[PDB]
Enzyme design. Structure first.
Site, PDB file in Angstrom:
ATOM      1  N   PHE A  55       7.230  -5.652  17.963  1.00  0.00           N
ATOM      2  CA  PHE A  55       8.601  -5.202  17.734  1.00  0.00           C
ATOM      3  C   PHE A  55       8.954  -5.402  16.256  1.00  0.00           C
ATOM      4  O   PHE A  55       8.519  -6.380  15.661  1.00  0.00           O
ATOM      5  CB  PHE A  55       9.473  -5.994  18.709  1.00  0.00           C
ATOM      6  CG  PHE A  55      10.662  -5.185  19.178  1.00  0.00           C
ATOM      7  CD1 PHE A  55      11.506  -4.541  18.272  1.00  0.00           C
ATOM      8  CD2 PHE A  55      10.869  -4.980  20.539  1.00  0.00           C
ATOM      9  CE1 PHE A  55      12.562  -3.750  18.710  1.00  0.00           C
ATOM     10  CE2 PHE A  55      11.932  -4.185  20.980  1.00  0.00           C
ATOM     11  CZ  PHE A  55      12.773  -3.568  20.065  1.00  0.00           C
ATOM     12  N   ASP A  56       9.677  -4.473  15.616  1.00  0.00           N
ATOM     13  CA  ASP A  56       9.892  -4.532  14.172  1.00  0.00           C
ATOM     14  C   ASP A  56      11.175  -3.790  13.805  1.00  0.00           C
ATOM     15  O   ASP A  56      11.391  -2.669  14.245  1.00  0.00           O
ATOM     16  CB  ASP A  56       8.732  -3.917  13.390  1.00  0.00           C
ATOM     17  CG  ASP A  56       9.037  -3.617  11.933  1.00  0.00           C
ATOM     18  OD1 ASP A  56       9.413  -4.575  11.209  1.00  0.00           O
ATOM     19  OD2 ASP A  56       8.980  -2.437  11.541  1.00  0.00           O
ATOM     20  N   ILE A  73       4.367   7.073   8.192  1.00  0.00           N
ATOM     21  CA  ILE A  73       3.523   7.844   9.076  1.00  0.00           C
ATOM     22  C   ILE A  73       4.089   9.257   9.194  1.00  0.00           C
ATOM     23  O   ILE A  73       5.287   9.450   8.969  1.00  0.00           O
ATOM     24  CB  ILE A  73       3.411   7.163  10.449  1.00  0.00           C
ATOM     25  CG1 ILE A  73       4.797   6.951  11.077  1.00  0.00           C
ATOM     26  CG2 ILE A  73       2.587   5.854  10.388  1.00  0.00           C
ATOM     27  CD1 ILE A  73       4.756   6.437  12.481  1.00  0.00           C
ATOM     28  N   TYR A  99      -1.089   6.042  13.537  1.00  0.00           N
ATOM     29  CA  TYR A  99      -2.204   5.315  12.879  1.00  0.00           C
ATOM     30  C   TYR A  99      -3.568   5.638  13.491  1.00  0.00           C
ATOM     31  O   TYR A  99      -4.568   5.028  13.077  1.00  0.00           O
ATOM     32  CB  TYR A  99      -1.959   3.812  12.986  1.00  0.00           C
ATOM     33  CG  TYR A  99      -0.707   3.380  12.267  1.00  0.00           C
ATOM     34  CD1 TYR A  99      -0.723   3.177  10.899  1.00  0.00           C
ATOM     35  CD2 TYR A  99       0.494   3.187  12.959  1.00  0.00           C
ATOM     36  CE1 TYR A  99       0.417   2.773  10.222  1.00  0.00           C
ATOM     37  CE2 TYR A  99       1.653   2.823  12.291  1.00  0.00           C
ATOM     38  CZ  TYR A  99       1.610   2.611  10.920  1.00  0.00           C
ATOM     39  OH  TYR A  99       2.727   2.176  10.242  1.00  0.00           O
TER      40      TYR A  99
HETATM   41  C1  LIG Z   1       1.180  -0.597   9.535  1.00  0.00           C
HETATM   42  O1  LIG Z   1       1.889  -1.667   8.931  1.00  0.00           O
HETATM   43  C2  LIG Z   1       3.203  -1.830   9.295  1.00  0.00           C
HETATM   44  C3  LIG Z   1       3.861  -1.064  10.247  1.00  0.00           C
HETATM   45  C4  LIG Z   1       5.209  -1.270  10.516  1.00  0.00           C
HETATM   46  C5  LIG Z   1       5.887  -2.279   9.861  1.00  0.00           C
HETATM   47  C6  LIG Z   1       5.246  -3.038   8.904  1.00  0.00           C
HETATM   48  C7  LIG Z   1       3.891  -2.839   8.627  1.00  0.00           C
HETATM   49  O2  LIG Z   1       3.254  -3.559   7.647  1.00  0.00           O
HETATM   50  C8  LIG Z   1       2.360  -4.576   8.105  1.00  0.00           C
HETATM   51  O3  LIG Z   1       5.895  -4.038   8.224  1.00  0.00           O
HETATM   52  C9  LIG Z   1       7.323  -3.885   7.999  1.00  0.00           C
HETATM   53  C10 LIG Z   1       7.698  -4.592   6.716  1.00  0.00           C
HETATM   54  C11 LIG Z   1       6.577  -4.467   5.625  1.00  0.00           C
HETATM   55  C12 LIG Z   1       6.746  -5.300   4.308  1.00  0.00           C
HETATM   56  N1  LIG Z   1       6.427  -3.018   5.381  1.00  0.00           N
HETATM   57  C13 LIG Z   1       5.336  -2.262   5.564  1.00  0.00           C
HETATM   58  C14 LIG Z   1       5.712  -0.974   5.301  1.00  0.00           C
HETATM   59  N2  LIG Z   1       7.020  -0.988   4.949  1.00  0.00           N
HETATM   60  N3  LIG Z   1       7.461  -2.229   5.013  1.00  0.00           N
HETATM   61  C15 LIG Z   1       4.860   0.256   5.272  1.00  0.00           C
HETATM   62  C16 LIG Z   1       5.250   1.366   6.244  1.00  0.00           C
HETATM   63  C17 LIG Z   1       4.191   1.666   7.280  1.00  0.00           C
HETATM   64  O4  LIG Z   1       4.994   1.853   8.471  1.00  0.00           O
HETATM   65  C18 LIG Z   1       5.336   3.090   8.829  1.00  0.00           C
HETATM   66  O5  LIG Z   1       4.964   4.079   8.279  1.00  0.00           O
HETATM   67  C19 LIG Z   1       6.256   3.074  10.043  1.00  0.00           C
HETATM   68  C20 LIG Z   1       7.523   3.867   9.749  1.00  0.00           C
HETATM   69  C21 LIG Z   1       8.471   3.209   8.755  1.00  0.00           C
HETATM   70  C22 LIG Z   1       8.846   1.838   9.293  1.00  0.00           C
HETATM   71  C23 LIG Z   1       7.601   0.969   9.582  1.00  0.00           C
HETATM   72  N4  LIG Z   1       6.546   1.670  10.418  1.00  0.00           N
HETATM   73  C24 LIG Z   1       5.729   1.052  11.314  1.00  0.00           C
HETATM   74  O6  LIG Z   1       4.781   1.665  11.865  1.00  0.00           O
HETATM   75  C25 LIG Z   1       5.926  -0.448  11.587  1.00  0.00           C
HETATM   76  C26 LIG Z   1       5.433  -0.820  13.011  1.00  0.00           C
HETATM   77  C27 LIG Z   1       6.282  -0.232  14.147  1.00  0.00           C
HETATM   78  C28 LIG Z   1       5.683  -0.546  15.496  1.00  0.00           C
HETATM   79  C29 LIG Z   1       5.676  -2.026  15.744  1.00  0.00           C
HETATM   80  C30 LIG Z   1       4.911  -2.685  14.643  1.00  0.00           C
HETATM   81  C31 LIG Z   1       5.419  -2.333  13.227  1.00  0.00           C
END
Ligand SMILES: COc1cc2cc(c1OC)OCC[C@H](C)n1cc(nn1)CCCOC(=O)[C@@H]1CCCCN1C(=O)[C@H]2C1CCCCC1
Length: 126
Positions: A55-56, A73, A99
């Protein structure tokens, strides 16, 4: 709950019509404009594996990104481009638009289905 509702009722907003990105509008936004590619975009979101198991959330600490520029993504570039200022939407996303088979360990496993609730706060034209 919400992920299963998006499976059942969501609109397929993909070009290929492969159900890779499904959307429900939860709260309607203001204005005719939606973000064009290149825009600087401001959101609140809550995300999770569709399994519920990780969860995030931004509303924990808004998340800022440039649309269409590979900082997020593919499903976000697709989905957020459909949204109006003030809109809250639910997205359910197949691994091909997130991913993939590689995943992104340890946070994301191989072949993961993702769920997000997104609020579009603002977007400004580069
Ligand atoms: C695959 O890695 C992660 C995925 C997601 C969150 C992540 C993350 O980092 C390990 O940490 C959130 C905070 C960090 C500092 N961060 C990373 C990114 N932006 N902030 C880079 C963005 C990559 O994420 C995405 O493209 C998507 C859409 C934007 C919001 C975050 N996204 C995610 O996929 C989360 C994910 C959601 C599902 C549950 C686990 C976290």
């Amino acid at each position: 709950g919400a992920p299963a509702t998006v499976t059942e009722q969501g609109e397929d907003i993909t070009s290929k019509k492969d159900r890779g990105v499904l959307k429900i509008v939860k709260r309607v936004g203001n204005g005719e404009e939606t973000p064009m590619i290149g825009d600087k975009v401001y959101v609140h979101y809550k995300g999770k594996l569709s399994n519920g198991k990780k969860f995030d959330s931004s509303h924990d600490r808004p998340f800022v990104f440039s649309l269409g520029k590979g900082q997020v993504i593919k499903a976000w570039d697709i989905g957020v481009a459909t949204m109006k200022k003030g809109e809250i939407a639910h997205l359910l996303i197949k691994p091909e638009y997130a991913y993939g088979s590689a995943g992104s360990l340890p946070k994301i496993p191989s072949n993961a289905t993702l769920f997000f609730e997104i609020e579009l706060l603002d977007f400004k034209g580069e």
